[PDB]
Design an enzyme around this catalytic site. Sequence first.
Site, PDB file in Angstrom:
ATOM      1  N   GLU A  63      71.274  26.996  80.202  1.00  0.00           N
ATOM      2  CA  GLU A  63      72.646  26.316  80.340  1.00  0.00           C
ATOM      3  C   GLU A  63      73.198  26.404  79.224  1.00  0.00           C
ATOM      4  OE1 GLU A  63      71.935  22.258  81.255  1.00  0.00           O
ATOM      5  OE2 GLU A  63      74.342  21.925  81.789  1.00  0.00           O
ATOM      6  N   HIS A  64      74.715  26.488  79.301  1.00  0.00           N
ATOM      7  CA  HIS A  64      75.453  26.614  78.032  1.00  0.00           C
ATOM      8  C   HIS A  64      75.968  25.118  77.763  1.00  0.00           C
ATOM      9  CE1 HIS A  64      79.395  26.642  75.688  1.00  0.00           C
ATOM     10  NE2 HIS A  64      78.682  27.707  74.960  1.00  0.00           N
ATOM     11  N   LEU A  65      75.711  24.505  76.868  1.00  0.00           N
ATOM     12  CA  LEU A  65      76.275  23.076  76.385  1.00  0.00           C
ATOM     13  C   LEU A  65      77.289  23.261  75.277  1.00  0.00           C
ATOM     14  CD1 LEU A  65      72.798  21.558  76.423  1.00  0.00           C
ATOM     15  CD2 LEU A  65      74.554  21.557  78.335  1.00  0.00           C
ATOM     16  N   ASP A  90      60.336  20.643  67.023  1.00  0.00           N
ATOM     17  CA  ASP A  90      61.048  21.366  66.094  1.00  0.00           C
ATOM     18  C   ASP A  90      62.530  20.860  65.816  1.00  0.00           C
ATOM     19  OD1 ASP A  90      61.468  23.430  64.140  1.00  0.00           O
ATOM     20  OD2 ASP A  90      62.125  24.736  65.817  1.00  0.00           O
TER      21      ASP A  90
HETATM   22  N1  ATP Z   1      72.235  25.947  75.477  1.00  0.00           N
HETATM   23  C1  ATP Z   1      73.113  26.099  74.347  1.00  0.00           C
HETATM   24  N2  ATP Z   1      74.609  26.321  74.699  1.00  0.00           N
HETATM   25  C2  ATP Z   1      75.397  26.431  73.751  1.00  0.00           C
HETATM   26  N3  ATP Z   1      75.257  26.908  72.113  1.00  0.00           N
HETATM   27  C3  ATP Z   1      73.881  26.708  72.063  1.00  0.00           C
HETATM   28  C4  ATP Z   1      72.687  26.656  73.035  1.00  0.00           C
HETATM   29  N4  ATP Z   1      71.662  26.473  72.385  1.00  0.00           N
HETATM   30  C5  ATP Z   1      71.754  26.983  71.385  1.00  0.00           C
HETATM   31  N5  ATP Z   1      72.920  27.110  70.790  1.00  0.00           N
HETATM   32  C6  ATP Z   1      73.746  27.364  69.595  1.00  0.00           C
HETATM   33  O1  ATP Z   1      72.998  28.450  69.058  1.00  0.00           O
HETATM   34  C7  ATP Z   1      72.385  28.100  67.871  1.00  0.00           C
HETATM   35  C8  ATP Z   1      70.983  28.619  67.597  1.00  0.00           C
HETATM   36  O2  ATP Z   1      70.089  28.440  68.841  1.00  0.00           O
HETATM   37  P1  ATP Z   1      68.516  28.030  68.681  1.00  0.00           P
HETATM   38  O3  ATP Z   1      68.306  27.078  67.434  1.00  0.00           O
HETATM   39  O4  ATP Z   1      67.995  27.641  69.827  1.00  0.00           O
HETATM   40  O5  ATP Z   1      68.112  29.708  68.070  1.00  0.00           O
HETATM   41  P2  ATP Z   1      66.832  30.102  67.298  1.00  0.00           P
HETATM   42  O6  ATP Z   1      66.993  31.586  67.019  1.00  0.00           O
HETATM   43  O7  ATP Z   1      65.615  29.649  67.764  1.00  0.00           O
HETATM   44  O8  ATP Z   1      67.056  29.153  65.887  1.00  0.00           O
HETATM   45  P3  ATP Z   1      66.148  28.282  64.866  1.00  0.00           P
HETATM   46  O9  ATP Z   1      64.643  28.502  65.453  1.00  0.00           O
HETATM   47  O10 ATP Z   1      66.414  28.873  63.453  1.00  0.00           O
HETATM   48  O11 ATP Z   1      66.661  26.911  64.997  1.00  0.00           O
HETATM   49  C9  ATP Z   1      72.232  26.653  67.891  1.00  0.00           C
HETATM   50  O12 ATP Z   1      72.459  26.206  66.446  1.00  0.00           O
HETATM   51  C10 ATP Z   1      73.681  26.308  68.550  1.00  0.00           C
HETATM   52  O13 ATP Z   1      74.860  26.438  67.754  1.00  0.00           O
HETATM   53  O1  LIG Z   2      63.839  28.396  61.906  1.00  0.00           O
HETATM   54  C1  LIG Z   2      63.651  27.453  62.030  1.00  0.00           C
HETATM   55  C2  LIG Z   2      63.862  26.188  61.024  1.00  0.00           C
HETATM   56  N1  LIG Z   2      64.730  26.404  59.715  1.00  0.00           N
HETATM   57  C3  LIG Z   2      64.738  25.124  58.821  1.00  0.00           C
HETATM   58  C4  LIG Z   2      65.478  25.542  57.544  1.00  0.00           C
HETATM   59  O2  LIG Z   2      66.196  26.702  57.815  1.00  0.00           O
HETATM   60  C5  LIG Z   2      65.729  27.811  57.907  1.00  0.00           C
HETATM   61  C6  LIG Z   2      64.473  27.761  59.059  1.00  0.00           C
HETATM   62  C7  LIG Z   2      62.564  26.919  63.124  1.00  0.00           C
HETATM   63  O3  LIG Z   2      63.585  26.427  64.269  1.00  0.00           O
HETATM   64  C8  LIG Z   2      61.947  28.189  63.928  1.00  0.00           C
HETATM   65  O4  LIG Z   2      60.970  27.652  65.029  1.00  0.00           O
HETATM   66  C9  LIG Z   2      60.738  28.517  63.109  1.00  0.00           C
HETATM   67  O5  LIG Z   2      59.684  27.455  62.704  1.00  0.00           O
HETATM   68  C10 LIG Z   2      61.117  28.988  61.635  1.00  0.00           C
HETATM   69  O6  LIG Z   2      61.506  27.960  60.915  1.00  0.00           O
END
Ligand code: ATP
Ligand code: A1A0O
Lengths: 285, 289
Positions: free
Chosen positions: B88-90, B197
Amino acid sequence: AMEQLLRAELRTATLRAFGGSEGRAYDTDAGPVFVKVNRRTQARQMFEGEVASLEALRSTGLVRVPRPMKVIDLPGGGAAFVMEHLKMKSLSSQASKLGEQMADLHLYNQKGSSYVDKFGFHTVTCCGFIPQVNEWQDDWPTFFARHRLQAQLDLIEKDYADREARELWSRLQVKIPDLFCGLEIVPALLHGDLWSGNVAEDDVGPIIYDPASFYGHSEFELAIALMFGGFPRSFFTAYHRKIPKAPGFDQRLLLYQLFNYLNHWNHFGREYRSPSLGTMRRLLK
Amino acid sequence: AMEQLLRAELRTATLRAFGGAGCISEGRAYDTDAGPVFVKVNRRTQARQMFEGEVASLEALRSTGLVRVPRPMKVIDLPGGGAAFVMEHLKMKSLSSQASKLGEQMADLHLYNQKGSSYVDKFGFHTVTCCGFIPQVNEWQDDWPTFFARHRLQAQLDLIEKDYADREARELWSRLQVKIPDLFCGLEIVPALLHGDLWSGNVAEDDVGPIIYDPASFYGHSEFELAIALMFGGFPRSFFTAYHRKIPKAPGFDQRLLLYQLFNYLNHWNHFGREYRSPSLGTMRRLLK
Ligand SMILES: Nc1ncnc2c1ncn2[C@@H]1O[C@H](COP(=O)(O)OP(=O)(O)OP(=O)(O)O)[C@@H](O)[C@H]1O
Ligand SMILES: O=C(CN1CCOCC1)[C@@H](O)[C@H](O)[C@H](O)CO
Ligand SMILES: Nc1ncnc2c1ncn2[C@@H]1O[C@H](COP(=O)(O)OP(=O)(O)O)[C@@H](O)[C@H]1O
């Protein structure tokens, strides 16, 4: 492709994209800014090298880079680096323009009025997290072997004590001048870390950032761009229309990629041992 | 705070954090016939496993009814490897005004296993959830310090040994292992469902209230949740004030905070490289001091 798979899996006719190290953008009164944060003790030195690289690139007027604003010491250690914010998207439409600009950047030193006649740089710049020596050298193979390859392999010996890397380097080091004989090498100002993740574009043109600059052989720039992919073919076409591949380009390309593999071994560990050693063996065959 | 330092260093009244995206996957929003969606793409072999863990985490959080998280929709295998995760987009902005509300919700989430019709009396989870790229063992264990030492810290340090062969990390860990039970002050630890996380990049808000996403859930010690929230900043003080009004700090909180931050430093060393060796080793030394 991706979009088609999503249309099929989600059963939608339309599918219209929207919305486009501890780096955070912040809306600000005097215009938007982007702030990079690094909590380690060496952060200031690293950021000052980045500032120095950005300033050198900006001085050419040939490539668009974020304007550095401030380096701030952080309570509890490390530093923040504040720069001009730029709305950016993946490099695509502006790939050929960026190839042209990068070739002009590499030609800028030799063609200008204030010629830098050695390889190196006036200050330390970091490729990723590891500080490099930029001590000026007249001879590019000397500079590269000593202050890039040997430096990385000394760290590998110290942290990993890797026998194969030691023996292969003993053999390869003497062979390096064969790849440079009969060619004129002119110092060229390099971005220094031109991975596809460090380039982008806006509606006006291409943008590059996160430099680790020094004066080197122009060809070194392209090694990281090719090894990790991400650049449209038209980037390279445009670049080599201005700076054609000199004889021996493909063999030097392996040497320059070797540096990047070693740097990735030192940053990320033994996942990069196999490409490092394999590249050294290809160079020795 | 960084905001205060930036407002002072740059001389600005307002400062609002904004904003492919993510450090693990490529994230993109699309409008569709049925409405907007958000899609994460990861090309590695393990991507499906990673996203299936995220789906299970999102579902566990949504079943509590105590926090708002995106509804998972589909995990799709990609030609050429990897997977795409549609959810779902938020519409979201950085967490600010809704921080105290989120502190209340997170404490209620941690307390749900003890106060609600929940009966999980072991630590762990019913399926694998990934720390970033790294698959975790979630094998159920009666003892939290055992679960955390074996299936979180030892797992990270075995990967550090395989990829970095770091002598100092090996030797400090052997000493720290002996210390770990002392850090728990004889307390009876109760399993709590965790987001897993909760760094400031994984929380946000809209006009209804706070939102959280990208979980890597398991039943753990409640305190573990807060460590990543603290170490990377970005949460207003009122988040922690609201949280600890409901769940006060047990004795030894400050030393366990170092243990739980150590886990995150090791994980960042494994994900992002040697930049994180110094804080990992320094944290182990501080615990041994
Ligand atoms: N459901 C959603 N709807 C809209 N924007 C979203 C949604 N989920 C994530 N985002 C946006 O996308 C960004 C990245 O999403 P997410 O943190 O899930 O990715 P990731 O690659 O696993 O990142 P990380 O593990 O480094 O936190 C979020 O910081 C947010 O800005
Ligand atoms: O990327 C993540 C957390 N960040 C916090 C500080 O800036 C860079 C990475 C996690 O969201 C991901 O699941 C994994 O644990 C790698 O960190
Ligand atoms: N000046 C800027 N304005 C806007 N976004 C930026 C700017 N600099 C970097 N970014 C964003 O941050 C990401 C990482 O920047 P980079 O300089 O490579 O950081 P790091 O050295 O921490 O990896 C970029 O991919 C881009 O999306």
